[PDB]
Each structure stands twice: as C-alpha cells, then as structure tokens.
Design a protein around this nucleic acid. Structure first.
Ligand SMILES: [Zn+2]
Lengths: 141, 55, 185, 142, 187, 67, 100, 75
RNA sequence: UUAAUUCCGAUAACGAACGAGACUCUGGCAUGCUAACUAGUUACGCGACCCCGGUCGGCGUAACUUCUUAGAGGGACAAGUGGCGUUCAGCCACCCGAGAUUGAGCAAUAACAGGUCUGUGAUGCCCUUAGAUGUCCGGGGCUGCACGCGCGCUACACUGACUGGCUCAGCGUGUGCCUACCCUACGCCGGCAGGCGCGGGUAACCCGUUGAACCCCAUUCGUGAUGGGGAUCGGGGAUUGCAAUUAUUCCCCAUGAACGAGGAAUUCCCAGUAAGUGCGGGUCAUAAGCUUGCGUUGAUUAAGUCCCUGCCCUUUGUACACA
C-alpha cells in the first residue's frame, strides 16, 4: 500500500478538494465571496471555491499533527504585512474563518473532539485517507 | 488646602511612577529585572552586583 | 552509472577546446563533472583558487547582482537550465561547445591604463573573468523593461558571441577596447 | 539476522540529521518518505550523486531511517547527504570486510570532501556600530 | 520565598542587597578603620564578619554600635529577631592593603602633614613590608588655581592582562577640603 | 609571523644544556619530557617551546650552534 | 522517596566539588544515587554606555553573567538526607530539596 | 513618443498566420510569439493553450512563467 | 623579518620590565570517561488502517548514551617533504590531517584650556531666601516654517504584480516590594478591529516540537507615470490611560501624485563578506522608520603599493621658546 506522506502534497490537496466538491455538504456561506482572508493580504482570493482548499489543508494538518487550535491554524496562514512606506513585519491569519472551517469539519463525520482542545481524526476517517491515498497513487500510476 | 492639589495628578505610569533610587533622575532607567537604576551608577557599582567584562 | 555523467542531459564528452591558454584555467574537465552546479563556497582562498571553480558555477553566481537578486541561486540555476534548452533547439550542436567557442572569441588581450597611457596585456584568467562579467552585464542591461526573459537574453547573447558579427555585448566591448588599445599605442 | 543498528549524525550547519542503518530489503526513507517529492525539483540529482556512482547493487541490503531537525532546506539536503554517506561508510566499515569498504571509500575520496568531512563554516556574530559584521555606518562630516 | 519569585530576579535583588549592605557600612565605618565584610549564608542565621583593622574603635563601649547596627539591619531591610549576627576580625598584613593605607593617609592630609614626606614615608613603609610595586596618582589643585597630577611610581607594575584584576589592589579615595575636592588613586 | 619569543629562547637552551642526554628528534618524545622537567602553564606555550626545542635539535643534527 | 535536589551556583568548580562530595558521601552512607544531571547554563548580556554625556564616539559595553544548574536524584528517607545536607555547606551553592 | 499597439483578440490574417507559420517555425516561446504577432501576453498564453488543446505542438519543459514549446517533430 | 623595539646579527655595551607577544571567554573534533522520567535513542506489547508485510509527535514498561545538555582532560606545533634566504632569524608550495589565520576583552609613557555643574545629598564661588531661581494643579510650548544640511525607511518593476499549496531557526522573554503592571493555551461571538468566562508554569514542564520571511510548485497580467509606489485626503468601527485635536494606536472602504536606473561630489568593506529578507531585548498606560544580538539564502573582484588623505621615526638650519 501507499501513504499520504509518500503521496506528493501538491496534487493531494487538489484531489481532496475535488473529493470535497464531490461531497458538497460542508456549509459554505455567502460572505466568503466578499471576505478578505487576513489583514496582511491585499485582495480577495482568485478562485471561487477556496473554502474547500482550506478544508482539505485543515484535514491533512489534523491528520499529521493533531491537537491544534486557533494559533496553529493562523500560523500557517501568514505572510509579509506590507503596511506601506514602513518596514514590513509578520501578521497572523484570521480566527473566525478557521473557526468556521473547524465547525464544518466537526459537522462532517470525519473528526472527533479531544480533551484540552483539538480535533483528532477518527479511525473511520483514517480508512478514508488511506483510500484516497490509494486513489491518488492509482491516478499517478 | 495645598494637600488637595498635592494628590491630584496620578502617578500610575512611566517615569512618574518609578525613578532612580540613587540619583533620582528620569534618565537611563532600566525596568528589566527590577533595577530602576541609572546607567552611570550601574557602571560604577557594576562589579559589586556580579557583572564583569569578560568578552 | 559512474562511467558517464550527464549534466542534465549532456555528457562530459564532445567538448573540444582549441585554445591551450584558456584550457589550463578552465578546470571543468575531468574533475568537476557534476549533475547540478550548486555548491556552498570556499573558492577564493588562494590567489589561483578562483580558476578551480567551474565555469557553470561561475555563470550561476555572476548573475545575482544589484541588491534585489541576492539569494536567487535556485532561480538562476533553473534559468540557465532553460537557457540550454533555448540554445540547443536553435543551434543544433553542443551548447557546451558553443560556450567554449564564445569564451575563445571573447577575450580582451590588451588594454591601456593611466599610470600617457600604458597599453599592456592582461592575464587569461582576467580575460575569462572579463568575458563572464561583460556577458552578465549585457544580459542584465538587455533584460530590463522588456517581455524577453533572462534565459532568452542570455541565449541570444551566447549565440551572437558564437557568431561574432559585432552583435553580442561582450564581442562589441572586446572589439571596442582592442580598438582603443590599438589607437593609443 | 541480528539488528545491525548504526546511528551516525551528520552536521555541517544548524540543520542536523541522524541516519540509522539496518539489514534487510532496500528502502531509503527520511522520516517515512522517499527522495521523490523534494521541493525544489532542481536538486533531485544532488542526493542521487552518491546513489548513481555506487549503483543499485550497493543499496540492495541497506535501508536508512533519517530524522532531521533545524536549519533551512538546502542545509537539510547537505545534512542528510553527509549523514547517509558517513552512515554507509560506518556500515561497510564495522560489519563487512575492510577491502570492500576501501573500494567504496576510494570513490568517495576522489569526488568530494563534503560527503565525508564537514567544514567549520558558521555565521559570524554581528559587531556593534554597523549594519553587519564587517560594514560600518556612514560617517557624518561637517 | 513563600510566594516563590523567579530566580532570575532573585539574584538581582540579592546583588542589590549586597551592594547596599556594602555601601552603608563603607559610608558609616570609614572613620573606624573599615576594610570589608564577609558573609557565609546559613539557614536562620545571617553570619556577617566585619573584617576591621581597629577592633577597639568599632565596638565603642562593649559593642554598643554593633547592637545599633543589628537594629539597623533589623529595621531597614526586615529580619526577625536573632536572624543576623556580627563578628569582628582583625585585618592581617595591612601594609599591602591599599584601602587601609589610603584611609590612614586621607585623615592625615586632611588635618595636617607634609605633602611629599608623607607619600615617601608610606612608600618606604610598604616597600619595607614587601610590596612589589606602587602607584600614587594625586589629582586636583595644589596650593594654587591650576590643577597638577602627581605621580610616584617605582618597582615592577604590570598594567594589561587578565590575572591583573586579582594581582593588583586598586583604591580610589576623594578628600574634601573647604576650597576644593582632590582625588587619590592608590595601587 | 610565527616568531619564537624570548621566553621560549631563554628556556629552551637551558633545558637542552641541562638535559641534553634525555632528548629525541621526535616531537612527542620531548613534549612529555618538558612536562616532567618544566612547569608550563598553557598548551600553546608548551607546544611553541617543544617545537623550538625540536628546531634546535635539527640545528644540532645539521651542525654546531653558536648560542 | 523520589528526591530531586536542585543545586544552583554561578561558579563551576565549587559546584562540581559540592556535588562530587555529595555523591561520594552517598557511596559511604550506602544509598541509591543517580549521576549528576547537567542542566544547561543561562546567559545575561548587558549593553550600556560609558560616557555620562552624549559627546564623542558611541561606546557599547558588554557585561556578561552566567548561572548553572545541577540536580541529584535520590531514593532515600528524609532523615538520612537531612544529615547529609547539614554537613559541609558553603555560600556558593544554593540547595533546593524536593520530595515527590 | 513610443506606444506599441498590441492587439487584444485574434484577427483573420493573424489567425491564418497562427494556423500556417507556427507549425513551421522551430522555437515557440511566448515573448517572441507576442513580439511577432503584436499581441498581449494573456492572448499569447491563451493561443498556446489553444495549440496544446489542438495537438500540433510538443511540450519540452513547462512552467508557470516561461513556457517552452516546439513544432511537430521531423524524424 | 613580521600586525609588533618579534628574533639572528653588528657589538661600548651587558643585564631587565612596561605595550605587544604572553593571558581569559566563545567556535571548529574526541562513537575514549561520568551522568540524565523537566533531553532522548532503539525495540517489546496494545489500538487504528491497507493487501505475509508497511505506516502512527496514538499508549504502558526493557537496554543504552548514537542526538541534545556539560565536569575533567587532548590535538595543532611549522611537526613531515620540496624550494628561497648569512643557510641564522625566518618565508613559500605540497601529502596526511575537524582545523596549517574564529572573534573579542585587557590594553606602555605623555598631553589637550576636548566634553560633563542639565546624572549625582562629588564639590568650591556668586545669586536667590518668602510675593522664593524651592514645591504643587489646569493648559501651551518642546513637533511649530520662505530656506540649507545630518541619521534613517520604501519604491521607480517582468528578475516583476495577485491568489493559494508546500517546507525550516537560535538569541530571548514571563505570576511581582511599595504597584495595578506577566506569557498566553483552548472552545465561541464578528468581515476585520475587539469582547465573554476559562486551564499550565515560578520554568529543557506552560506558550512551543517556535509550520517566521525569502524560497520552490500551481492559477491571473503584459510595457501603460502601469495591477509597482501609497506621498495626499474623506467617512465609519474598536483598545489603552481620569483625560487624544495639531491626527496615542489598530481595522474597513474610497482618493492614485512625484518617481523612466539618476549630474557635480562622496561613505563602508574585503569570505558564510556585502547584499535580499525576517525575529527577540531596551525605549514601553498606548510604543518602532531608533539601537543591539539571533537566524535563512548567498555573489563580483584581491593576495600588491605609498601616486592620492592622514598618523609614526630619521638626518639637520634652527623666523618652531610655564614651548
Ligand atoms: Zn548616575
């Protein structure tokens, strides 16, 4: 068999986003079209279905490193805070959009809440991760 | 009386709250590790505290 | 296999150097046969340690100048890797042989200086370094406010240097400096 | 057979790695992944330089587990490149005979020293009164 | 400590405590032949030893000033009754001691004595006691308006190096006249 | 500028003139002999003195030494 | 029974002598003792000015300060350990006895 | 002073030239294609995706910024 | 001869020290010694998954110091070979070897009409001394503007502009002495700003196993003072202190100029160096265009000299004399 670490993570997130588009029950609001991701970013994201990419990334990050809250999600969503003529710094991501991603993934039956915070991944979802890893392996082979 | 105007401005922030304990000057105050001591007297009695210039 | 080493898709063989002077300074043959020219450093200790550095690594390192390009070695290796593809599709022959012929053609021997002006010859290592600096400066001057990329400009400069029709920047500055040195002697 | 455990560290910079050798089938892994998804893809052949020179016969019995911490990315590449090379030299040194180890070592000596011996190149500390270590500020005249 | 403060601030507070405990006794016992104090910390007993030259002058009358200094330490810094104790010990080899000769010379030059003869007498006394080298730098004004830096250096005297900080013994004193303030650097 | 100093030159000639018998051309031989007969505080000074002793032994094996 | 005695000191050789004396005393008093667990030191850099007035060239000081930490693990009743800690104290090493 | 009138969309003569001459030239690089056809970079990339969907070009080394394509092979 | 009055040598000179050399802290390596449940490694067994075997920073306990941390010592010395030089002091190339130059501190004699009374209850003299040149409250000013310079920051783009995906650090810091002021973890409310109660730590435990920037990969643009630049300006929403306008500070929208690689002149530096690009500490009711350390990527040229600007000795007329 294969594993998601042997699977390259560039096409794995796109295949999992295609799987979540095949599912299509992950609570997409209407303010996603008008929202900006964070204050260090300038404009809106280009692709319209950019909730499912964040959901796929949150799924693989909770699969690899479980037990994470708001700060571990805002750490990966960061960049250069270009204020202007002032020298730039680092800024954290938004909290509410990651909280809505966690609420959508908790409403979907693939995770389970853990003590002292965090959403671990259930053995039912581990089978699904292994099957989609086999699907990406069969697609690349 | 004058005691009403004496305790009128609060001293709850910055150099109005804390000052040097030797020269009582509002210049060169280190708030780190609770020193509250000017840099000239710090360089003077720097060896008696335990600091030394090795490198 | 250790019998043959393919630099991307190019072996060590089919490299003929005509000039015996530049072949002693260029030490890419028989020792520095690599797959990628990436390295850490320490090629500037001895006076003649700089000649032991391979010319592909020199072409890699000499591109990054003028502040904003510092720290783009991973960029410029891929740029030169595309530049080999641009050269080979138009030329047909070996791009390594094209580059060796360009180094043979672009050598400024004599140059005057203010010490009257004393017109004297320079070192062959100085000729190689001057040729590399002139080709990188010409590529950086050509690729500015233009859609044409770094690999395309560097490929056009190497093809014009291999042709030798006063079109390349290094060939033009070589002919200009030899004209000035022939004038003031 | 018995567990042929060889643990060799590789240190060139802040990025460090520990290579663990074993008998059995040939599957080289770095924390449970092969060398095929390395970003960037430009340095794909850099870790295959010790692979292509020795051949597929030498890596048949050798499987290496690598743990990596610290540094950057290309520093981690040079760290694992030095660590698996020194672990492979120790593996051919300690268990099997010395003639094959010398035959493998004669290839690694002629090619590069970075595979075997590290250089003491670290970051020099910043000096006071300048933007960096060597450079100073601009002197204000008049 | 019961509230358990940080050990990073604990050594800083203890250094301030030792600095104030040194400075107060240096300012107070200076007329009675003060050299220094030595402390070995024991639980429930703060045993301090004032290593003093004149043991008769520091007691006053059956240790009255010592019992006053115990009350000073008890009231100012805050200690229970019986937590601190003082012991007086005589300073040995005071000829090579630089601060002991400086405090002896300061009151003599303040009251009245010859300028050159006192310096040559102290120099001859310490060279008879067995001092390797000496340095006397007297700054300030001398019987006039313009200042004049004196110098009396003879013998072996190293300046640079790392072990010199515990080789030599440096003393800085400031005499205060009614006209000016002069400085003496004994080494 | 690796010049042997006067503290090395005043010591090494006296050491060779006293213990001329217990010497050798090898560095590790007289490096441990100087540890026995002399009290050198530091390893760098010990190695400089031992290297100058081996250089004086090479001067002896070449010819006569004036000093 | 699990005793974690923490020894804090600025000096190195005095702390080494004290912990070696405690280990050699445990060997004489015949009790189970672990080795010296060497915790890493701490550094405190202070950069100040030399001149009181703001004239001339800008100077920068370099004041260094170090502190260490050792610990000795024990499996013994406290009546034996108090007799050991009562003997041979010095003002350099500070002892913190913890029984958990 | 100087302003190159780069075209936004295709024309009849430019479409006939893209159908005829582009399989005849050896090197197909988007900067040179835009310089010859006097077109914008977006349309120059979109014509390359049209040729990739048609199937008369050969992929040598693709990338986000700088693509490299050729004509149909000879041998 | 060298960074050196560092040594051979000439000898009316011999014999010493100061500065340097010498000495301390740090780095390059010692699979040889001692140690680790507030650092781990290798396996045993359980649980989950794929089709006899693999994966797990999911859990309990058997060996060990191979990683980390640090008490003790070592090696590196021109020691070996070949050339230059009185063949003396010494210098250069090469094999082998973690290194054939890591950086810093201390830094001789002598002097300035150099600064500091605006750091000092270090201080002389004069003045003030009650309607006070002392002490206290509410504001203003310290920012202010036809002009000239000093120290810094960001752009003038295609090497770039926008959006996601992927992948790493070590300095640090932190529960109170009057005194309130500390790090934040997690589930929520909201577009951001911000808010509600809540668990851990007196620290290799808690933040944290610091998913930092550049980077690489995949979409949108194409020579347009432009999507670069946000200088300039308006409206609304929040935190801090009793109290912010001349904008304390933060968030959203709108406004889109100068700037087309720079004249005379000029500053710094020579290998993990400049440079690109970040993060901690101090300044901190609010606090980084300041300063210092800690990181990542990583070049061109050079192994010479007094022609130019200074500093240090020399022979000698002496318009250079408490000089
Ligand atoms: Zn002061």
């Amino acid at each position: 068999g294969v594993t998601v670490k042997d699977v390259n993570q560039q096409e794995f997130v796109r295949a999992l986003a295609a799987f979540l588009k095949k599912s299509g029950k992950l609570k997409v609001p209407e303010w996603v079209d008008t929202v900006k991701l964070a204050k260090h970013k300038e404009l809106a994201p280009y692709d319209e279905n950019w909730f499912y990419t964040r959901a796929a990334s949150t799924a693989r990050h909770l699969y690899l490193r479980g037990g994470a809250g708001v700060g571990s999600m805002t750490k990966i969503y960061g960049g250069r805070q270009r204020n202007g003529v002032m020298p730039s710094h680092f800024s954290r991501g938004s909290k509410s959009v990651a909280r809505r991603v966690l609420q959508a993934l908790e409403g979907l039956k693939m995770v389970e809440k853990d003590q002292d915070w965090g959403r671990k991944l259930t053995p039912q979802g581990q089978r699904d991760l292994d099957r989609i890893a086999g699907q990406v392996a069969a697609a690349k082979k | 009386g004058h005691q009403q105007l004496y305790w009128s401005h609060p001293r709850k922030f910055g150099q109005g709250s804390r000052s040097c304990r030797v020269c009582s000057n509002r210049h060169g105050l280190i708030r780190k590790y609770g020193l509250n001591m000017c840099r000239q007297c710090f360089r003077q009695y720097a060896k008696d505290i335990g600091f030394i210039k090795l490198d | 296999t250790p019998d043959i080493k393919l630099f991307g898709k190019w072996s060590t063989d089919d490299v003929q150097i005509n000039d015996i002077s530049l072949q002693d300074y260029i030490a890419v043959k028989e020792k520095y046969a690599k797959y990628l020219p990436h390295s850490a450093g320490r090629y500037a200790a001895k006076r003649f340690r700089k000649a032991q550095c391979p010319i592909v690594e020199r072409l890699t390192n000499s591109m990054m100048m003028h502040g904003r390009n510092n720290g783009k070695k991973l960029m410029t290796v891929r740029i030169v890797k595309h530049a080999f593809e641009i050269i080979h599709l138009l030329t047909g022959e070996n791009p390594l042989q094209v580059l060796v012929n360009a180094i043979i053609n672009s050598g400024p021997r004599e140059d005057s200086t203010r010490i009257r002006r004393q017109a004297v010859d320079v070192s062959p290592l100085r000729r190689v370094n001057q040729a590399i600096w002139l080709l990188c400066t010409g590529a950086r001057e050509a690729a500015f406010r233009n859609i044409k990329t770094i690999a395309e400009c560097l490929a056009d400069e190497l093809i014009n240097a291999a042709k030798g029709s006063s079109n390349s920047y290094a060939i033009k500055k070589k002919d200009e400096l030899e004209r000035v040195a022939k004038s003031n002697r | 057979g018995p567990l042929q455990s060889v643990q060799v560290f590789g240190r060139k910079k802040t990025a460090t790695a520990v290579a663990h050798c074993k008998r059995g089938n040939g599957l080289i892994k770095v924390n449970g992944r092969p060398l095929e998804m390395i970003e960037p893809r430009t340095l794909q052949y850099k870790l295959l330089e010790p692979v292509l020179l020795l051949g597929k016969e030498r890596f048949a019995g050798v499987d290496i587990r690598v743990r990596v911490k610290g540094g950057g990315h290309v520093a981690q590449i040079y760290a694992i490149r030095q660590s698996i090379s020194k672990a492979l030299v120790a593996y051919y040194q300690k268990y099997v005979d010395e003639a094959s180890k010398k035959e493998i070592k004669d290839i690694l000596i002629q090619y590069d020293r970075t595979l075997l011996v590290a250089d003491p190149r670290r970051c020099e500390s910043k000096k006071f009164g300048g933007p960096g270590a060597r450079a100073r500020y601009q002197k204000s005249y008049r | 400590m019961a509230v358990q403060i940080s050990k990073k601030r604990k050594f800083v507070a203890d250094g301030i405590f030792k600095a104030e405990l040194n400075e107060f006794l240096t300012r107070e016992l200076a007329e009675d032949g003060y050299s220094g104090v030595e402390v070995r910390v024991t639980p429930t007993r703060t045993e301090i030893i004032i290593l003093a030259t004149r043991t008769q002058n520091v007691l006053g009358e059956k240790g009255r000033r010592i019992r006053e200094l115990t009350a000073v330490v008890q009231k100012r810094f805050g200690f229970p009754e019986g937590s601190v104790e003082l012991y007086a010990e005589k300073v040995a080899t005071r000829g090579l001691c630089a601060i002991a000769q400086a405090e002896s010379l300061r009151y003599k030059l303040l009251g009245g004595l010859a300028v050159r003869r006192a310096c040559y007498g102290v120099l001859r006394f310490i060279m008879e006691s067995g001092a390797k080298g000496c340095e006397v730098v007297v700054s300030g004004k001398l019987r006039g308006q313009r200042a004049k830096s004196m110098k009396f250096v003879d013998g072996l005297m190293i300046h640079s190096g790392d072990p010199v900080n515990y080789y030599v013994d440096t003393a800085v004193r400031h005499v205060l006249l009614r006209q000016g303030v002069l400085g003496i650097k004994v080494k | 500028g690796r010049v042997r100093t006067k503290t090395v030159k005043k010591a090494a000639r006296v050491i060779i003139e006293k213990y001329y018998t217990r010497l050798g051309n090898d560095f590790h031989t007289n490096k441990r002999v100087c540890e026995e007969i002399a009290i050198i505080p530091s390893k760098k000074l010990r190695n400089k003195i031992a290297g100058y002793v081996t250089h004086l032994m090479k001067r002896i094996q070449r010819g006569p030494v004036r000093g | 029974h699990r005793i974690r005695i923490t020894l804090t000191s600025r000096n190195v050789k005095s702390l080494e002598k004290v912990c070696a004396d405690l280990i050699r005393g445990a060997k004489e008093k015949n009790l189970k003792v672990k080795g010296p667990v060497r915790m890493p030191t701490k550094t405190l850099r202070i950069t100040t000015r030399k001149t009181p007035c703001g004239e001339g060239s800008k100077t920068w000081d370099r004041f260094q300060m170090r502190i260490h930490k050792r610990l000795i693990d024990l499996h013994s009743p406290s009546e034996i350990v108090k007799q050991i800690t009562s003997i041979s104290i010095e003002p350099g090493v500070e002892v913190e006895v913890t029984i958990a | 002073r100087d302003k190159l009138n780069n075209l936004v969309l295709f024309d009849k003569a430019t479409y006939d030239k893209l159908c005829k001459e582009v399989p005849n030239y050896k090197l197909i690089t988007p900067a040179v294609v835009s310089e010859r056809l006097k077109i914008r970079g977006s349309l120059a990339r979109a014509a390359l995706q049209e040729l990739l969907s048609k199937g008369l070009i050969k992929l040598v080394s693709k990338h986000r910024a700088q693509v490299i394509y050729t004509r149909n092979t000879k041998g």
